[PDB]
Symmetry: C2
Subunit: 281 residues, 2 copies
């Protein structure tokens, strides 16, 4: 780990200037400039829209929200107990410091959404504790938590795993909400989804930038394996556990979109595409 510019001991770690890595610094500034709070999302005119929905459309959205409820918390857990601690480069710690704060805002946003659409407290506890109630989302959670507690996996494998969590595990639900936007529905849900997605894309690109700054990283086959496993888990979630059919989407094109996102991630990582499919949406 001493030959790793990103992980090796750094005595100038506590001071910001002079900037050592301008690429990392610019990433941080883009994140900082993107700051927003949950309060900025108007949900007053949304309780009505939630009613104008079909029993299946509410069933879908509520389940997606169930996954998003703790997801950002899990990510922050990793960033606090791991990434932010391991990396010694000031610029990177700055990016991670902001990522943690934004993930907590994302976490609040999703809770606010659930709280706003599900008035019945009985249903609430069922969704809030989705990682302890809904087996479907329990799997995506365990996958992520495993990478947090895995003491064998190198930073290289781990940073790739969370890039998958924030890119691939978010992609399906993201696309679903953007579909609703086109259909003119839930302006509160789709608007927050636009701000959050802008952050995730940023969290993903940073993950790829950290990967590039790693000297000894996992082989391509291992990266394809991790990405591919996340792809399947994400497809199984949106074409089986919770079919996007419930909102008028083709379960086939959704699977293809997931792969398209996995391919973009691979390119960003500096590798060749895995699936070689176009973005259907």
């Amino acid at each position: 780990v001493e030959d790793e510019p990103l992980l090796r001991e750094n005595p100038r770690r506590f001071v910001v200037f002079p900037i050592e890595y301008h690429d990392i610094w610019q990433m941080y500034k883009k994140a900082e400039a993107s700051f927003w709070t949950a309060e900025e999302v108007d949900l007053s005119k949304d309780i009505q829209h939630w009613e104008a929905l079909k029993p299946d459309e509410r069933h879908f959205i509520s389940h997606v929200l169930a996954f998003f409820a703790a997801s950002d918390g899990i990510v922050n857990e990793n960033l606090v107990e791991r990434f932010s601690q391991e990396v010694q480069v000031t610029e990177a710690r700055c990016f991670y410091g902001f990522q943690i704060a934004m993930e907590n805002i994302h976490s609040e946003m999703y809770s606010l959404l659930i709280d706003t659409y599900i008035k019945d407290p009985k249903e609430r506890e069922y969704l809030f504790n989705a990682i302890e109630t809904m087996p479907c989302v329990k799997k995506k959670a365990d996958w992520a938590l495993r990478w947090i507690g895995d003491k064998e996996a190198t930073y290289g494998e781990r940073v790739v795993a969370f890039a998958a969590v924030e890119g691939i595990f978010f992609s399906g639900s993201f696309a679903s909400i953007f579909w609703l936007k086109k259909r003119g529905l839930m302006p509160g849900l789709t608007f927050s989804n636009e701000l959050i997605s802008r952050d995730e894309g940023l969290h993903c690109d940073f993950a790829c930038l950290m990967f590039k700054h790693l000297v000894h990283k996992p082989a391509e086959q291992r990266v394809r394996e991790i990405i591919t496993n996340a792809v399947r888990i994400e497809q199984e979630f949106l074409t089986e556990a919770l079919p996007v059919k419930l909102i008028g989407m083709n379960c086939t094109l959704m699977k293809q979109y997931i792969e398209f996102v996995a391919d973009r991630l691979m390119l960003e990582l500096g590798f060749n595409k895995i699936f070689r499919v176009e973005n259907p949406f």
Copy 2:
């Protein structure tokens, strides 16, 4: 640690709602609402003011800035490797997530200040690495770093130590800059100092709130001891190592102010005042 509501295992840790502690949550919202970036501080009209200063007034300010250069970094180091990891209460992790992001902005601000006033790169490296060059600030730094690596000290003693770092170690330099403001000087320096101080007061109050949520905490005598040791170190820094006389301040009243701040901290902690002196300024 299992009987500590703040440190015990929490399965609902990843989700924000429902709010368990509204007192902690409100602290977080106050912090969130106080957000600001370094870019918002106009330093264009400051290079001129730095010139209209006396050789001693620049000597003082540059040394205070030397301490502030890494101080926020050290604080963030503790919050990341310790506090944020130990505490399992969602609301508290949210406050700490924001504290970390703001400390990094504070860190940038001070670097920007130094970079802006000291054009010569020779002087810069001497101040940026003050914890490795200036013995005077090296002592205040080691004191803080010790609390970070001390594996024996309980969270109770440690949270009290950093409340002292952010309250007592900041107080002297803070008062000095507010003195300059009265004297109409360095509008860039005094303006940032107002925003930063607003955050520190908030970081200090939160520290006291966490202390209150601790069941088994250090005895009062131990708290007085930690606070008192910080007081002395801070006075020795501003009446010996770097006399506030250099900017037209009475070294005696400054020592009294430090004690007045130590007393406010004690009250906030739920204990009696130690020095019982009025705020001179």
